[PDB]
Design a protein around this ligand. Structure first.
Ligand SMILES: CCCC[C@H](NC(=O)[C@H](C)NC(=O)[C@H](CCC(=O)O)NC(=O)[C@H](Cc1ccccc1)NC[C@H](CC(C)C)NC(=O)[C@@H](NC(=O)[C@@H](N)CCCNC(N)=[NH2+])C(C)C)C(N)=O
Lengths: 99, 99
């Protein structure tokens, strides 16, 4: 659908069979989800944001549903302020910015 | 215009008489610009995200042109790693997320 930005663009996602709320973030290269138990193999990496760097678990080829749309790709799991859906998955659901 | 998300959604902006490149960020509530000697009154505040918080100067009623689109609002100035256009200004230029 078309989403305006007067409020945070929050949507419901399904990951690991569990429902969560996440923010569609065009300023995020990657997708970062709060700590959780997620089925799959992972590797430790570090990512950066506005305030600095944090340690996260990188999971590849993870099936995730975003607002009813299917995506399968890399999901980083760690101590993020909020769940964010980044460009790696926004492109998969065909999201674009328009004005 | 329509901006795909294959790469970072960077656009040219004009602020304080200077042209800069900025990232259209739907995951940012506010607008944060790289350290610049903007004239006028300001208030010190703290903003955060991945990695923690940073100290910025809050300026009200700052004129800013985003990809040819004029806007006026609150602009934060500080040691941000990237110039970020947040929702406070994205709404003014009528930007939406579409999928
Ligand atoms: C005016 C009052 C402000 C009050 C103040 N508000 C805030 O701090 C609000 C919540 N912060 C935000 O909205 C901030 C942006 C700053 C801002 O707008 O203020 N948003 C953010 O920080 C969001 C995530 C988030 C969202 C909501 C809450 C918390 C965090 N991240 C935005 C960020 C943009 C990037 C260009 C710096 N992206 C990222 O951090 C992603 N990282 C990346 O994409 C990295 N690969 C980038 C390269 C690494 N660095 C480098 N090369 N130098 C990450 C999510 C995988 C407060 N609450 O204290």
């Amino acid at each position: 659908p078309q989403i305006t930005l007067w409020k945070r663009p929050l949507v419901t996602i399904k990951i690991g069979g569990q429902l969560k709320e996440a923010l569609l973030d065009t300023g995020a290269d990657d997708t970062v989800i709060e700590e959780m138990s997620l089925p799959g193999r992972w590797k430790p990496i570090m990512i950066g944001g506005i305030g600095g760097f944090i340690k996260v678990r990188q999971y590849d080829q993870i099936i995730i549903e975003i607002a009813g749309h299917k995506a399968i790709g890399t999901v980083l799991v760690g101590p993020t302020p909020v769940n964010i859906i980044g460009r790696n998955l926004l492109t998969q659901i065909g999201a674009t910015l328009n004005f």
